[PDB]
Amino acid sequence: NLPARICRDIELFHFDIGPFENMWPGIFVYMIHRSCGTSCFELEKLCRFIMSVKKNYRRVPYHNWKHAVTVAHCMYAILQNNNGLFTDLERKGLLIACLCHDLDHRGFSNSYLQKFDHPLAALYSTSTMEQHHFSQTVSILQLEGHNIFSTLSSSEYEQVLEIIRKAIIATDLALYFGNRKQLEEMYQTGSLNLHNQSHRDRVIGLMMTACDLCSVTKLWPVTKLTANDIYAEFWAEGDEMKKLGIQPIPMMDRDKRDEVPQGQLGFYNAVAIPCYTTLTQILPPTEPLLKACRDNLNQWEKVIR
Ligand SMILES: c1ccc2nc(COc3ccc(-c4n[nH]cc4Cc4ccncc4)cc3)ccc2c1
Ligand SMILES: [Mg+2]
Ligand SMILES: [Zn+2]
């Protein structure tokens, strides 16, 4: 059972899930239990599913099992603080989508897989890794005793898999820019309609971005340490690009590491702040993410001064 400190701190948007890997499953079960019900999934089936998901994440610096549960936690905190908006089925789906959203990631971007001519990029031309993450999700569900959705009707089953599919695809950051532009225009014209399925999908997609980027909404020590793991992957990819004979973008070039703070400024300005600003306009109870994001922007500006 969860320690008292976790029971309290887990409700904070800026909760960090800690270094004890064996606690992460119970943290996820607790979150799912509170967001749906303890008669939401069969406990034994769910545990088996969780452990098989864990096993198909890799030991990479950032796109690992810890990131998966951290992203699920952000989604938990958004849903907990926006009660009455999402159906039981959406909440179930979104927490599972978050847990599964980087399955079998290698620590390389879609663009690297494309330049490499990796077989996955011939199979899935766009949002390559994200299509694979969803394929892995389904393959795990199809294992004997791993169908956590077995009590649902076939219709509800197809529905939840489509919720998961759209939510995982949406974590392809290339899609965020267009989605967020559409959502901002909808907000300002007063045309956003949460009862319209296409708008609803967009909002869920932004939520997925916000959860995926959530390292920038933690307290500064967490944010700064998490950035080390992110760059360990980016620089490894940059090395690989150099080995293909291709000059990497500065973000992936370890030789431009002194430009990290400027690079962070750029990301906060073009990606993170607009993401949480738009999210807060649609779901005002998510304001603490935006606030923590602004505080971290200020820290990066302080690093530069
Ligand atoms: C030279 C040197 C350093 C540079 N640094 C940047 C900053 O890039 C960032 C900043 C934050 C994040 C981030 N933090 N938490 C989640 C994410 C998003 C992310 C993570 C993993 N894979 C894909 C997306 C990603 C990239 C930009 C340009 C640069 C140029
Ligand atoms: Mg991903
Ligand atoms: Zn992710």
From Swiss-Prot:
This protein's domain notes: The tandem GAF domains bind cAMP, and regulate enzyme activity. The binding of cAMP stimulates enzyme activity. Composed of a C-terminal catalytic domain containing two divalent metal sites and an N-terminal regulatory domain which contains one cyclic nucleotide-binding region.
Positions that bind 3',5'-cyclic GMP: H63, Q264
Domain PDEase, chain residue ranges per copy: 1-305
Function: Plays a role in signal transduction by regulating the intracellular concentration of cyclic nucleotides. Can hydrolyze both cAMP and cGMP, but has higher affinity for cAMP and is more efficient with cAMP as substrate.
Tissues/organs with expression: Detected in striatum and testis (at protein level). Detected in whole brain, hippocampus, olfactory bulb, striatum neurons and testis.
Regulation: induction: Up-regulated in brain after seizures. Up-regulated in the hippocampus one hour after induction of long-term potentiation.
Family: Belongs to the cyclic nucleotide phosphodiesterase family.
SUBUNIT field: Homodimer.
Organism: Rattus norvegicus
Residues annotated as binding a divalent metal cation 2: D102
Subcellular location: Cytoplasm, Cytosol
Active site (catalytic residues): H63 (proton donor)
Chain positions recorded as a divalent metal cation 1 binding sites: H67, H101, D102, D212
Name the UniProt record assigns to this protein: cAMP and cAMP-inhibited cGMP 3',5'-cyclic phosphodiesterase 10A
Sequence positions that bind 3',5'-cyclic AMP: H63, Q264
